[PDB]
Amino acid sequence: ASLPHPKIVKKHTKKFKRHHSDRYHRVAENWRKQKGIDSVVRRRFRGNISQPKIGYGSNKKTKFLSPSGHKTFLVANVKDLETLTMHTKTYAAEIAHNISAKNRVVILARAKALGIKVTNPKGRLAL
């Protein structure tokens, strides 16, 4: 398709889970930096969870890109498709979840008409 752009396999794919979220149910997995004085996670002891930081940032020339190489644009109608028309190979439409079935098939038909990629062109239909 295109050139082998960077961010091939491994920078950090694992989710950054909050400390002790597995220990307690009251503790959600949404990341929270440990502010404790004696916290081993904050103190960065060996064998502990890794903390989010700026070093993990993905390449600027590939950030926000999907595996297909397209940035995902949330679309609610053929008007958003029209604004996505001229950038087919770099953008991919994604129908909003609260779109009715008939309108969803309308967006799918229009996106097929102008070649715009859709990241969920399979919902609310049979095979």
Place this chain on the structure above:
Amino acid sequence: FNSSIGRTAQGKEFGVTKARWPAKSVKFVQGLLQNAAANAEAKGLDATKLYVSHIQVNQAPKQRRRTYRAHGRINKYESSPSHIELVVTEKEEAVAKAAEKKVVRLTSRQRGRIAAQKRIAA
């Protein structure tokens, strides 16, 4: 639910040491078994190949009472009622067999090797 209960010989049939004779639970369960047998008879089932295919007892809302303790204190005295459900089904043989075909993907080297083996075989 067997902590600190006694032991008996009548558990050796099940390989355990702790068994009891819960008369009230047995009466409730056998009443429900009779009800299920009646339901199956009304449905036209065999009633001789019937086996308990599903059974489940879960907790019900507690019935609250009070007990009186030393030094003018009040503690709960609660019953633990049961929601019992069971489904008796006509017993049948093995449901199905002949699993998926599991299409095989062979490379050029593998196809050449199998062709050579087939040619060598006589």
Place this chain on the structure above:
Amino acid sequence: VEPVVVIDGKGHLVGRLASVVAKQLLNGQKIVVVRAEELNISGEFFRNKLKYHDFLRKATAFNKTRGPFHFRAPSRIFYKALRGMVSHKTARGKAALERLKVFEGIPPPYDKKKRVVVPQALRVLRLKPGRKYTTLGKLSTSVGWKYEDVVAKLEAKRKVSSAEYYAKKRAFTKKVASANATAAESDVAKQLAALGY
């Protein structure tokens, strides 16, 4: 190299042999050790008896049945050394100790087969001449091993059997060599020799 390596313990220093065997087991080689009663320890017999007496003194205060277990057999003494040199509380250590086998004397499946030597652990090659050493069988009998005489009798029986086998093999081999000499000095033998075989 080999699927199973059989080492006889006679003339070997317990620590050096245990270290070598432990490294081989970790590298993945199955090992059996025989003549563990004829294994050797450097130092006076009294010194090693005192060391084992300290080991015996070590035991759990509140339950000796869960305390350290002081095995008296020579093969189990060698096993204790090897288990000390192998990380035995992990699955890799359990695998290595399963790969290891130790015996007193040589049971049939191993006395009918080949026994190798470890020069790095041999007492003659390692110890300075004149330095005192100890025999594992004697030390084990001192600390309470009850089968020195039985193992000695069985080893004597096996040694006579092996001596008769060796006499038969030596006679057969010398006849083979005599016939090879008769059929020798041929073109094929001369060609092989001049080539370098």
Place this chain on the structure above:
Amino acid sequence: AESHRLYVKGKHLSYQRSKRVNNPNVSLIKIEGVATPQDAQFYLGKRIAYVYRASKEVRGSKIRVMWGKVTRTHGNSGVVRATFRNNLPAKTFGASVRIFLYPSNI
């Protein structure tokens, strides 16, 4: 006749490691018959296969293989350092591996 081995037997021993930290990306290989870095040099830059068997047929076979190569020596006793396509499972410590003669130079 009875022998068809075109490789050299070796043992995957462990990972590259310090006393208390290991690096799974590099494995240590003991080549059979090699006891010195001098022969390790001849064995440098050579393909390695770890061949194992799985109970499930994946692509027409029940045998799976991991590919790597001897890259450089390790120590004074003929142990070499190998890097595989995927790091070895670490249950294969002291496990049989095959070192092939290719890419050949002799």
Place this chain on the structure above:
Amino acid sequence: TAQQAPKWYPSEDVAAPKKTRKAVRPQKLRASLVPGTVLILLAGRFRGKRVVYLKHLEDNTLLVTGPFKVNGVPLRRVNARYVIATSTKVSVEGVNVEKFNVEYFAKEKLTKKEKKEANEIKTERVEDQKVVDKALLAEIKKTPLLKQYLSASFSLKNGDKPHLLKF
């Protein structure tokens, strides 16, 4: 809509790569393989099998043959890094070797639509192989035991250390 026109215009035209300075130079083969040397194929269908090296093809490959009558290896191409050169050598005089090339080893790649879900040789190719191997046998005959040496396949035995082993 959310926007009438994007103020920033992304690049649509793919950036053509600039002129790379990586020229191609002819491969330098190792000195241990000269045409006529007996090689040991180590991989493929004929792995561990002794063939004879004839020509260095233009696509960095080696043109070898069994000969076919000896061990069943036809006139093929192999890889220098996968062959093992030996001290044994046969003179390739009297053979024609300049006819074969990549055009000779054209593939005619099979199509994707044709898949073998259930389960030949050119007469010119077989005749060329016959002529070449006839000439090669006419050479090979004079050296004793060489025909059997090429017929036998190579293998590594217990105790064989290739680093200490001379080919």
Place this chain on the structure above:
RNA sequence: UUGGCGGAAAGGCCUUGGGUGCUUGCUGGCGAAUUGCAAUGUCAUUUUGCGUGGGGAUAAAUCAUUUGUAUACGACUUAGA
């Protein structure tokens, strides 16, 4: 099978016998390809089946009852067609 030996964990080691194969000890004839320049390129364990069939002699234990050389309950020691 005849003749043995081997109880340390023998379970293996030998031996006179008959039938077949193979033999590269030496000389031959035919075949190999296209797995397409390499892909481990697949080769020698514990059991199961409404199996493929040849031999095969068709039992115990537990609960319940009982005993008291036993016993908190288990367990134990007996009896009972």
Place this chain on the structure above:
RNA sequence: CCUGAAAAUGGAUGGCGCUCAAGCGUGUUACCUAUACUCUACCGUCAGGGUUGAUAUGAUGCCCUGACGAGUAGGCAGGCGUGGAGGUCAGUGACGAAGCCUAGACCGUAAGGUCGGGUCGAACGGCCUCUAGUGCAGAUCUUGGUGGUAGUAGCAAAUAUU
């Protein structure tokens, strides 16, 4: 090296063990590896700069170069999320909004966002701003609910029932 040299659970050159050592003193020399050093890629920060050729890039746009990156108390900056308000999307919706469940997917370093599949039936969201009763893991926090303990302690004074 030995004697001097004796303390209480069993016991510690880290352990095994080691005796021309695997001990002690001293010398070559090879070898192992830290988030350190060198080189390369990427992220961010900072600094120095280039850019008014088309009637294409709010020049807060694009681009070049180099250096740097620990962090409690604390400071500042840039962002995520919530309840309401003014605009706009003539935005989403009973052909299914909000909500909830889902070892299903994608994106962001992250706060989180978007989607796939179930349940559900009436409202709700993005963008530019305004506003605050705006983010919980703790406070022997408040209210409510629920566990293990646990079918456990126990339901044995007042003679006694058949």
Place this chain on the structure above:
RNA sequence: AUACUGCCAGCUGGGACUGAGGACUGCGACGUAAGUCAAGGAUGCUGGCAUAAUGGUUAUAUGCCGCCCGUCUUGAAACAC
């Protein structure tokens, strides 16, 4: 001549990791001039599958590592709360 030391803008060989990047450009090398180069960052050729094969997620297993968080404190895993 040769333990040695120092230098070579000396000659060969075997390995490994990496391949960042643009609409004319710069600095250079190579027979008495056509232009080509290893000179401001990888290309050429050839193979296998047109898929869970590579991968992402997840549950185990394995090697090494990993003390329970918040707080007071010079010092907390603490037999401190």
Place this chain on the structure above:
RNA sequence: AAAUUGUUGAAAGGGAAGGGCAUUUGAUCAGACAUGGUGUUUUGUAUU
């Protein structure tokens, strides 16, 4: 909804469990080869 429970079922289990780095195995899943390519032997050539 959660805590806390009973049952489709899946895996683990020698005095805890949970976690990080890295693979393996089993389960599951997205991305990608009708993409803007041959002008006429297959066709459903104003549809290419």
